[PDB]
């Protein structure tokens, strides 16, 4: 079995979180930087950590990572997330509204609006699921 | 023996298959059922009481029945499948499917399959005790 242990996974997580900038997509560079920046007493353990580091980097390349969060990239995450459509989806010149909400608005002193268009109510009250 | 008939028409018999849990009967009779053509049971095909209702014994009985009824010209067979009925089990015994498959495979032409096990509107007291069979 080739399942990574919580020691290797945790160390690789800490390495990505703290030393993201130096870490790259190549395994060998990951191994060298992990040797340089952390005391990893075993070459095999170094290599396991470097492999998980590489896989985690590919995971971030896919996009979001569920198991880690780095603020140095979270700022740019929020930078991308500031998406403003040119025309607001809430500014529709015609809004279909039901007669009951029409009556509610008329009682709300908003019966003189011009964007509202009354809708035909359903002819039946068959909304429940058949029991059984 | 058998009636002369065109080779494209099938003369029908009725195969009452009594699939009990202790024995299986394959009984081909006249369409009216009053005249018996052949009847073979599982116990005429094995020597062990435990195997009287086995699928193999029913298979042997059904093949014997099919051969005998073919030598009298009957080519098609209506099926009346029944369990014990009454108080006892309504589920047919293990030999029902075996007999049906054997009869189909033995060159017989299956007609209409019907289930005729005796169902009461309500019956006498069942053979078991109030607490049933405890073994």
């Amino acid at each position: 079995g080739r399942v990574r242990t919580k020691t290797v996974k945790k160390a690789a997580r800490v390495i990505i979180e703290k030393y993201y900038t130096r870490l790259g997509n190549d395994f060998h560079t990951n191994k060298r930087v992990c040797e340089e920046i952390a005391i990893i007493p075993s070459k095999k353990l170094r290599n396991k950590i470097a492999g998980y580091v590489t896989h985690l980097m590919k995971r971030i390349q896919r996009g979001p990572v569920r198991g880690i969060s780095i603020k140095l990239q979270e700022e740019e995450r929020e930078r991308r997330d500031n998406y403003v459509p040119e025309v607001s989806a809430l500014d529709q010149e015609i809004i279909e509204v039901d007669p009951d909400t029409k009556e509610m608005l008329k009682l709300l002193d908003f019966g003189s609006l011009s964007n509202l268009q009354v809708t035909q109510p359903t002819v039946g009250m068959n909304f429940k699921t058949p029991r059984g | 023996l058998g009636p002369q008939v065109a080779e494209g028409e099938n003369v029908f018999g009725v195969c009452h298959i009594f699939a009990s849990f202790n024995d299986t009967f394959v009984h081909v009779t006249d369409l009216s059922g009053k005249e018996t053509i052949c009847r073979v049971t599982g116990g005429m095909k094995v020597k062990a009481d435990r195997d009287e209702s086995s699928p193999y014994a029913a298979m042997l009985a059904a093949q014997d029945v099919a051969q005998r009824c073919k030598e009298l010209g009957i080519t098609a067979l209506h099926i009346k499948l029944r369990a014990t009925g009454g108080n006892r089990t309504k589920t047919p015994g293990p030999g029902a499917q075996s007999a049906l498959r054997a009869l189909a495979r033995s060159g017989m032409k299956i007609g209409r399959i019907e289930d005729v096990t005796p169902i009461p509107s309500d019956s006498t007291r069942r053979k078991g005790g109030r607490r049933g069979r405890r073994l």
């Binding site: 068959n126 429940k128 | 009636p3 003369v11 005249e35 289930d115």
Partner: protein
């Protein structure tokens, strides 16, 4: 040791004229020998033939029992003895969230054929119905049963056996009952469950021959 089938002869069994297919199959009987007459041993026979083997486009879950009323010239002329539904149909209609209304009548035809007719119907769940069950109340059930009995009597006592069978083949009695009971409680699967010949007039060859064509 000697097979008793060497002296058995085969007779064609004919259905009454109300059915499209006349040849319902082949019976057999031992040849006459003194007291044992082949003719007398052929008249008690009952053939339970599916209607689909008696009619062409009709359903197969309705069986008719025909009793061999006379034999002549290797031809066993039968007559209507009764009718039934197959076990599968009866078991398939009885479901667990509906009322089954049953009725029966003892009614004589115009030609003296006393028949016991059984009718079964089931209450029908509506298209928009949310409630799981579709039970009819006791007075509603009694009214539906009364309507079923009146319709069965009306359809039998004013007709003879020929017309009674002719309206049993399409089950027009069940359709009439279902139509008439939709104002009491909508019925779902209405059928004449079983017709049994209670009593029959004494045998006459003329009515048989008029029946066979």
């Amino acid at each position: 040791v000697v097979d008793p089938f060497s002296k058995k002869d085969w007779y064609d069994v004919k259905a009454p004229a109300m059915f499209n297919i006349r040849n319902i199959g082949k019976t057999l009987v031992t040849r006459t020998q003194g007291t044992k007459i082949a003719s007398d041993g052929l008249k008690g026979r009952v053939f339970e033939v599916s209607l689909a083997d008696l009619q062409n486009d009709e359903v197969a879950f309705r069986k008719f029992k025909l009793i061999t009323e006379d034999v002549q010239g290797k031809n066993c002329l039968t007559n209507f003895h009764g009718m039934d539904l197959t076990r599968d149909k009866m078991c398939s209609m009885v479901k667990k969230w509906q009322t089954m209304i049953e009725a029966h009548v003892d009614v004589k035809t115009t030609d003296g054929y006393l028949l016991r007719l059984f009718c079964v119907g089931f209450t029908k769940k509506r298209n928009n119905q949310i409630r799981k069950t579709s039970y009819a109340q006791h007075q509603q059930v009694r009214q539906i049963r009364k309507k079923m009995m009146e319709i069965m009597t009306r359809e039998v006592q004013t007709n003879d056996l020929k017309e009674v069978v002719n309206k049993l083949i399409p089950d027009s009695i069940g359709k009439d009952i279902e139509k008439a009971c939709q104002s009491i409680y909508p019925l779902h699967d209405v059928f004449v469950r079983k017709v049994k010949m209670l009593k029959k007039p004494k045998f006459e060859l003329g009515k048989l021959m008029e029946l066979h064509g």
